[PDB]
Amino acid sequence: LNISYTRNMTLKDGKNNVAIAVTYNHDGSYSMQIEDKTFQVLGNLYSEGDCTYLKCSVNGVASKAKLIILENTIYLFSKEGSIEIDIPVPKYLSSVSSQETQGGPLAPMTGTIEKVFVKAGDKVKAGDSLMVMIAMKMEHTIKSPKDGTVKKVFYREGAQANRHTPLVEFEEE
């Protein structure tokens, strides 16, 4: 009533946070200000087959693109190109007490263990090779994530290790 609603939105392009001030106009259009530049934006959503399409006009320039919003990423597909924009995730929703002191680099894939370079108790530094695994004839060398001493080893040479299974246990510090 008697004023215009302006919404402060934040979007992440790569590592850069972009602040967008969106004003809801009476006619149904939107006035967006990014930094010192203002844009007049109007558009709508229409469906072709199973794909949702965004028809928009920015400062009088009209374009069409395929819109997909999965998880926190906005995918825009246009014949000019494809752009991904990340929606910031509120801290509260992000698991508080996020996982910490992760020890085991996980097998890149299901493959035979060809070499083990670490004993049950061994002091290792970041970048110290722990194990070598061959998967579909492709050699991967597992490397030490931390400088912590090794608490235990979950696999021995010749064992087949499934994808994303812990390979080494590191002593709690």
Binding site: L1, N2, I3, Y24, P90, K91, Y92
Partner: protein, 529 residues
Amino acid sequence: YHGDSVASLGTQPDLGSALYQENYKQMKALVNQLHERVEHIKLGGGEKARALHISRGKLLPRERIDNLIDPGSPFLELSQFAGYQLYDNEEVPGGGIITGIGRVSGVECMIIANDATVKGGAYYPVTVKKQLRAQEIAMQNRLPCIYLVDSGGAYLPRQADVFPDRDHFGRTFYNQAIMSSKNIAQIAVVMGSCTAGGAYVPAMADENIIVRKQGTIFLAGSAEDLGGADLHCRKSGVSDHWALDDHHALHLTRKVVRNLNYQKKLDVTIEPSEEPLFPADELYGIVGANLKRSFDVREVIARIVDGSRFTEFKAFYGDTLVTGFARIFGYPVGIVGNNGVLFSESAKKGTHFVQLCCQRNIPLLFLQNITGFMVGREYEAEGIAKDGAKMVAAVACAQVPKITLIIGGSYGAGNYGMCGRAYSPRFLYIWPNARISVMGGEQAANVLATITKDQRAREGKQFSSADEAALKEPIIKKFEEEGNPYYSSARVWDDGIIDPADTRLVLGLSFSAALNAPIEKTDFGIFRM
């Protein structure tokens, strides 16, 4: 079968006519004046206060509401002009409190947020009245109440007008207790300091949320140790939910409302909505700002009802009053509007119409543009007072939702018959050109010009024409100043001053909110035949 073709109201105004050009220009200036004043009120305490508020990590009060309500949903703010020039040297934008109706998790709720940037959130006498009005609206319509609490306590220099009386600060907790007993959810969000009576608000709420460090609760006033989220959340137990920051608390509030297990049910029949057949901005030219000129109220109706369709009741009887059935955004409505001086026939026609709407449970809308009652020896002999009372008595007892819109003058007993503030309409709005007082400014001047002309003619000292305006000019100035819409709205006599182009939208939002409560059966008193 709803395929019948029907007639529609409204006519195309003469845009070239000088009267239309003048009326549009005058009304436009009033609307522009209204808009820019709200812009200033939007800023609250000011840049220094706002900068200090943000420096503490807290959101601005209006940003809190924006994040609380559903994305893109309209927000119906109430009494934006409370406290406007009310106090001699103190500026209190919006009364220090922001109240309105918005949608949270798909549910219409009443939101009451203290503006900490205005006098540190202290409660002025108008602040209490504005909050009490909001609570009254929530109870009458069964709207859940959300309190964004950030307050500094009562304003001691004016304590006598805040603490003691029935409609003083104490009534706020009484309303919370009553609504809770009726299953009208009371949710409090402590986003700041609350002291003395303020601490009772979170305690009296059904569910309560407090921010980690900003929020503080204590009967007697470090603040964090005495109060604080941790103490109440973990030790005192006063806190039901613990929030990291303002954004987290608002997210929690939306979750709380979603668990109310409430679903809206409509008692009225619904039909598809249709836009009016005429532009709303034409109301500027049609109405203007000169109350002495008269316009056809049907023109106003034609530009707010669905499809400009209107079924007039008793069109040729008591023509100074217009009554009929229409629909706004699909809801059925019975409209009563003034089209001249009230007569005995007009009052009888209104009384008959109000009974019809109450019988069918149809909401009522009143359009007040009054100029008084018919004055004459014959009319009194025929019981005009008896007829006028018939309408005051029917309007009072009606239990259907009632909304009043003052589009012109509102004087004397005509105000009561047209559902004034004293008759508990669910909402009351006024246009920027309205005037309200016990009587018109001129009538009070002329009446006094009879009493003292008599005073000196009968006494015998002559009283000249120049002595007349030393009598009349101060009276006219007083009534003009006290009848101004801003004077009426600064105090909470109405729920806001609205742009005429926004009339249809405001009515649609208001009626939608009023339908959250079931419509009760109407019991009338004795009709003095």
